[PDB]
């Protein structure tokens, strides 16, 4: 509390006025209020300096625990599928689709699932530098494996080569990431522009231009994959994998078009959660819409594991 | 219409789950905008896929 | 702005202290800062109340 002048009355006579919010008074009989320093805020009695609450997507927050659980589920499922293709390495179904591409795609899906983990926790400078590049590169690698696994795509580039396609498609975005991380790298940013009792930790993208190029290239590759899979969906080769690629790309677009309003309309820590969900969703789609059917046939009803069927 | 039912419900779930971290922490006009967008997306998904 | 006490100095010797947000001062040489009514908040300049 502070002293306030009464009109016409001497200095010894004063009214006690409670300290404004944000400022505090430690010593008794203080003639003025002292603003709490930066990083600190007034307490409930306006007497002390409580450290302002630090807000970020916590690992112990229910959202953090749940999204880590789902990302770990995705990691386990990808390891499951990879181990199934390893155990039955030379079965006709695993042999028909290029199995080296299958291992590459499953490793890339592991990277995609693990990239969401770089969004839970206190954002560090290296974490914010790694977040978008990691998912971008991993998901472009996934889309590239799927894009060479479909039809009339290897042929058009030719007019093995599979690795050349996947390498160029990943390498262009790696070049984007290197240019971005060298010119205007992201960082961590403590925001006090939100609720003043809280410091909220954000990642600061160096430039939305590089983020736009990253997202646009990842979307263009998926659009090419969808366009080429659309004109192949009727083919029963590899258990209608062309129409399943179409399904995976459609899920990708549903997830990343329902992400714009979800990202724009989200404020606070949970914004990171938004990203995680989208990441997970896309990854899951791909995995299921590419693998699970085949995996089922590999492990259940093995009579279809023949050269004729695939 | 198996794939169409499946994708209608996929659009439903995906849209409504993407808005969980928004509905969890937001206030004001944005809450109603989120609700309208989710409703319009689920309804448009059903309409499109089914018909 | 309100008046603030310089201890060890007479009452006529005051300093000018900015009114806290939500409190306005529409007068000259006002002792305390006046609080805005309900459904009302102080301006940027803290001189009056706006709804
Ligand atoms: C992380 C959470 C939110 C997702 C959990 C769902 C997926 C892990 C699984 C569960 C149900 C699975 C589906 C169950 C059944 C089918 C039917 C299947 O249709 C067939 O043509 C099979 C024909 C046959 O049975 O021989 C295609 C795969 C699909 C969509 C499976 C894809 C993978 C799905 C979606
Ligand atoms: C769609 O494919 C992708 C390619 C790269 C990254 C991503 C996701 C994981 N992050 C988007 C970054 C979100 C964003 C958008 C606009 C302005 C600021 C920010 Cl922060 C998706
Ligand atoms: Ca007097
Ligand atoms: Ca004196």
Curated annotation (Swiss-Prot), chain A:
Glycans are attached at residue 45. Residues 1-63 are annotated as: Cysteine-rich (CR). It is found in: Cell membrane. Residues 228-243 are annotated as: Intracellular loop 3 (ICL3). Homodimer; disulfide-linked. Interacts with VCP. Interacts with ARRB1. It is linked to Hypocalciuric hypercalcemia, familial 1: A form of hypocalciuric hypercalcemia, a disorder of mineral homeostasis that is transmitted as an autosomal dominant trait with a high degree of penetrance. It is characterized biochemically by lifelong elevation of serum calcium concentrations and is associated with inappropriately low urinary calcium excretion and a normal or mildly elevated circulating parathyroid hormone level. Hypermagnesemia is typically present. Affected individuals are usually asymptomatic and the disorder is considered benign. Hyperparathyroidism, neonatal severe: A disorder characterized by severe hypercalcemia, bone demineralization, and failure to thrive usually manifesting in the first 6 months of life. If untreated, NSHPT can be a devastating neurodevelopmental disorder, which in some cases is lethal without parathyroidectomy. Belongs to the G-protein coupled receptor 3 family. The extracellular regions of the homodimer interact in a side-by-side fashion while facing opposite directions. Each extracellular region consists of three domains, LB1 (ligand-binding 1), LB2 and CR (cysteine-rich). The two lobe-shaped domains LB1 and LB2 form a venus flytrap module. In the inactive configuration, the venus flytrap modules of both protomers are in the open conformation associated with the resting state (open-open) and the interdomain cleft is empty. In addition, each protomer contains three anions, which reinforce the inactive conformation, and one calcium ion. This is Extracellular calcium-sensing receptor. The lineage of its organism: Eukaryota, Metazoa, Chordata, Craniata, Vertebrata. The gene is CASR. The chain holds residues 550 to 872 of 1078 of the full protein.
């Amino acid at each position: 509390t502070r002293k306030g002048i009464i009109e016409g009355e001497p200095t010894c006579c004063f009214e006690c006025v409670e300290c404004p919010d944000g400022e505090y008074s430690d010593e008794t009989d203080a003639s003025a209020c002292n603003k709490c320093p930066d990083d600190f805020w007034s307490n409930e009695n306006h007497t002390s300096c409580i450290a302002k609450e630090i807000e970020f997507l916590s690992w112990t927050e229910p959202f953090g625990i749940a999204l880590t659980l789902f990302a770990v589920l995705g990691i386990f499922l990808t390891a499951f599928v990879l181990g199934v293709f390893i155990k039955f390495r030379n079965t006709p179904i695993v042999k028909a689709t290029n199995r080296e591409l299958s291992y590459l795609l499953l490793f890339s899906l592991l990277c995609c699932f693990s990239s969401s983990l770089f969004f839970i926790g206190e954002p560090q400078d290296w974490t914010c530098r790694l977040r978008q590049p990691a998912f971008g590169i991993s998901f472009v690698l996934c889309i590239s494996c799927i894009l060479v696994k479909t039809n009339r795509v290897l042929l058009v580039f030719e007019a093995n080569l599979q690795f050349l396609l996947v390498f160029l498609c990943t390498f262009m975005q790696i070049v984007i990431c290197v240019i971005w991380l060298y010119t205007a790298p992201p960082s961590s940013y403590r925001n006090q522009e939100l609720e003043d009792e809280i410091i909220f930790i954000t990642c600061h993208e160096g430039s939305l231009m590089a983020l736009g190029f990253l997202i646009g290239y990842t979307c263009l590759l998926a659009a090419i994959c969808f366009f080429f899979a659309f004109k192949s969906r009727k083919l029963p080769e590899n258990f209608n994998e062309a129409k399943f690629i179409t399904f995976s790309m459609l899920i990708f677009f549903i997830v990343w078009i329902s992400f714009i309003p979800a990202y724009a309309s989200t404020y606070g820590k949970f914004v990171s959660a938004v990203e995680v969900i989208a990441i997970l969703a896309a990854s899951f789609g791909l995995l299921a819409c590419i693998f699970f059917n085949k995996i089922y046939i590999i492990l259940f009803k093995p009579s279809r594991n023949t050269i004729e069927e695939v």
